Design a protein around this ligand. Structure first.
Ligand SMILES: [Mg+2]
Ligand SMILES: [Mg+2]
Ligand SMILES: [Mg+2]
Ligand SMILES: [Mg+2]
Ligand SMILES: [Mg+2]
Ligand SMILES: [Mg+2]
Ligand SMILES: [Mg+2]
Ligand SMILES: [Mg+2]
Ligand SMILES: [Mg+2]
Ligand SMILES: [Mg+2]
Ligand SMILES: [Mg+2]
Ligand SMILES: [Mg+2]
Ligand SMILES: [Mg+2]
Ligand SMILES: [Mg+2]
Length: 133
RNA sequence: GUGAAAUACCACCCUGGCGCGGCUGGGGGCCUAACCCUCGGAUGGGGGGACAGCGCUUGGCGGGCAGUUUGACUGGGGCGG
């Protein structure tokens, strides 16, 4: 890689599990990008994609504005916006969409579901965050 | 742009691979000091050796033994029915 996140990886730690509100505020400072940062935080899920009965879909737009689908490998992705929103508001938006997921969580789906959510951007790292606290 | 999927820095995952480490399971070899055998001698020497033996536990083979079962009707009983 470059020195983009080799300047930035000694301040942000993947090893020791973290929670949202303390690890939420660093998402715009962790991206050294030149342009237009669109943050994406994600976790994979414990449902077997090999059966379509357990899949999940929809379109639910976020309150704040532009600026959910599971794959066949069983992870989850979604855009939360554009550069736009600041660092301290996302404790409000970092628990926002994350509670729209579990709405359509399947019943015959087996296992702990939000597994490892790593707060990231298009431009950014692996850092542990709790889905809840 | 004629394949529908886009060839960026990223993370989050699939599949096989190596790499380190964490809990590890399995194999091999050598060693002696437990344990076993032995030695005119021994707090020692030689041999076998963590096997074997012995305890607890697992499943198996098991008339060598043990306890028993092996029906009634019936022109006697069995055989047949
Ligand atoms: Mg030897
Ligand atoms: Mg010896
Ligand atoms: Mg001796
Ligand atoms: Mg000896
Ligand atoms: Mg020897
Ligand atoms: Mg033994
Ligand atoms: Mg008998
Ligand atoms: Mg018998
Ligand atoms: Mg008899
Ligand atoms: Mg009779
Ligand atoms: Mg008669
Ligand atoms: Mg008669
Ligand atoms: Mg008769
Ligand atoms: Mg008869």
């Amino acid at each position: 890689h470059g020195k983009r996140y080799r300047a930035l990886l000694e301040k942000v730690d993947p090893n020791k599990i973290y929670t949202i509100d303390e690890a939420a505020h660093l998402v715009k400072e962790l991206a050294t990008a030149k342009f237009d940062e669109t943050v994406e935080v994600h976790a994979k899920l414990g449902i077997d994609p090999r059966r379509s009965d357990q899949n999940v879909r929809g379109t639910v737009s976020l309150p704040h504005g532009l600026g959910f689908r599971n794959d066949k490998t069983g992870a989850i992705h979604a855009p939360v916006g554009k550069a736009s929103f600041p660092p301290e508001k996302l404790a409000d938006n970092i628990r926002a969409f994350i509670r729209a997921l579990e709405a359509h969580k399947p019943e015959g789906a087996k296992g702990t579901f939000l597994r490892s959510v790593y707060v990231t951007t298009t431009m950014g790292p692996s850092v542990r965050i709790n889905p809840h606290s």
